[PDB]
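step 4 of 6: structure.
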Amino acid sequence: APPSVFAEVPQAQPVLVFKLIADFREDPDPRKVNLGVGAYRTDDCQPWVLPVVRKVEQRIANNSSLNHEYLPILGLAEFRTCASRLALGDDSPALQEKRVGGVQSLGGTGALRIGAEFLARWYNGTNNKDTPVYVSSPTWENHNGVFTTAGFKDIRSYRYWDTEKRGLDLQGFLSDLENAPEFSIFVLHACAHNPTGTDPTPEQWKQIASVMKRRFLFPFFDSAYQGFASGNLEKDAWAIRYFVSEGFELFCAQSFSKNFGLYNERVGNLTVVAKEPDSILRVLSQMQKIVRVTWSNPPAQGARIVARTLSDPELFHEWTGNVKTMADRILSMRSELRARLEALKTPGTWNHITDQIGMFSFTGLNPKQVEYLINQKHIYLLPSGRINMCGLTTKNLDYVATSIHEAVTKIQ
Amino acid sequence: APPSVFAEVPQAQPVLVFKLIADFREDPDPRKVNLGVGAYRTDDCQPWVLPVVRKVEQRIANNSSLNHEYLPILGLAEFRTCASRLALGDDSPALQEKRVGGVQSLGGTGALRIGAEFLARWYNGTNNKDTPVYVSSPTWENHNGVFTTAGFKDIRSYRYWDTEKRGLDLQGFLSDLENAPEFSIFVLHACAHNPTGTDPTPEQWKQIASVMKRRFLFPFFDSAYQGFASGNLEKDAWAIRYFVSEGFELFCAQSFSKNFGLYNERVGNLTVVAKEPDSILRVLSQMQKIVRVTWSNPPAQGARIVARTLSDPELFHEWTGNVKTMADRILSMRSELRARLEALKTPGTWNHITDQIGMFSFTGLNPKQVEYLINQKHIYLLPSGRINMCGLTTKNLDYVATSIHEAVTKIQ
């Protein structure tokens, strides 16, 4: 009988983190620590629904005026406006000049996808899939995939993490910018670089911006941690705002997964900043055609929560407090880990633990050192030495610090 | 003076649909009727949040045990299981034989998109964009767009609507099936054909299935109105179930937008039926890669409401009553319009109004007659002659019938 039409479909290779996590789960050892987690966790190792979010969800549930009719293709107007305003600031020259557009998308991933699809059709000519796209070395796992799927043929890397110095390879980054073909697209992490936690300082950003301006390089910002990163919304959007100030046209993929803890409601926004107002209408008209054939129109729940929060001063104030709580817990785990490592007179420098920003940290541990932590200490992390600071608690900090100290001194 | 990178982006052409609603919205005329609407409306012309949905939303809102952590890439397990079972029936052999898979998607549109991307990569060879894709004449406009975007180069039409007979052109359809190259993909409406409202009878479906089986044509079902169509969930899924019983391997894109009235929560499911269990695992593995790069993972709200309703016998029962209420109102409008048009002794045969199923009806009016209805009577409908029966109410029912009589009589 005719074989299945699916007879030759291969089994896709599984992603590492999934296994690690499964592994972790199945470990009987009471001392087990999961540093491979990809989301915020409390001091009790639990997920955290923000108090303001719970509050807003109750208000929504009790709002009888709400219906479930389709939203416009581009999304809930109030959400698009509030989201763009959060990234750029109320006083943004671009907002005031009406040269900003926002497209509600399925998380930061959907925003990146829509933006990449637009660029593959209308940027640097028509249907030009040859424009080089540059991603940091290393970068969030899905960057390559989104761009590849949008049809970009030439995906490159720019030097970023310096393994020996455990910091930013600024000279390498600047050389890659200098050698990039004009109009190349650069995917930039706004703040809280994922996975390293290493960000350029404002002064370094100015250097980066200089080369981009001169060579007509396009800034495609990925902003998934605004406010979550430092507790300060304005500080966290500094680099985006600087580029705007400097007159760049850019895209900014915003995720509300982390800063609102709305991971599973898939709330994102693609902010577009153009040189002229008229361009916005034309660009959004094209974004609509791309959305229509992808998800048709976006979901309402997540966007309604975000729009409600950001537009009510009392709720806004409360949310800023909730964000600060998360940021503060991370700062705390970083300072505590570093202190302990140093108290143990651990070989090497560990100031990177506190210089880095956000949930993720490139520890500088090597693969052999990682193997030892998992196998022997029941401490789960990626082979890259990447850890999630939220996997640390007041209760396991000693264990982890001591185990790292062993790995470093005993393993080569 | 560096020009904008968006300087040459064209303004996308607007969607007629959108124009009309907008036109309608502005109509000063007190008698104006919008038969252009694309969602359910009550006899008062209001959106309707199903009672069971309001009930479950309150239950969700008060369930302190729910968090907002990312769902698995393929979606909420319980939702996928329930959604597939709804289409196939509890006793489906495919379910018993475990050769069914479901992918939670962003409405029926998202399910079609994921399905099309999978076929463009792994069906009838690898990366074969030349397999013909067949859509009905006419069809839901987004059909072409989704398949084109997925990469298919050869999109064909199969005869379906007979303008003269105001019914299904079965012989045309069958010839188109007979002439299609082996392995061609056929996009089939499960029930409540959009936009005609004209469905094959079970006997006609058997003739269609016969040819498909012989020529190895792939059935890609689009199921957006299950239950909503006839008021009975079982009747409406018959065609799908028949093909399963005949041993077809197939895709079924399910939308919960209409039958749950959850338009804005974007709840869909892609059901996959394979010859053997092993294939499902491999196919789903490939599906994950596709989702990952599109929306990453799906939203929870909509899916949770559906899963809760379908898994609770009491809520399920209440839901079936809500669905019948919607279906009954439509049947009532169909019967009434037909009756009035005939009492009016309107020229032409009107049994099609009653023979048609679902929200949408191809009235058979020419664009000339439509022009009039819009210009002269303030009755808004597409130039295709398509109307939404939900735009009719006990209150405008006469006006409309009256106006149709004139149109058909005054213009021709």
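step 5 of 6: annotate
 - Residues 15-48+328-408 of chain A form a domain with the Aspartate Aminotransferase, domain 1 fold (CATH 3.90.1150.10).
 - Residues 228 and 259 of chain A are 5 Å apart (CA to CA).
step 6 of 6: archive
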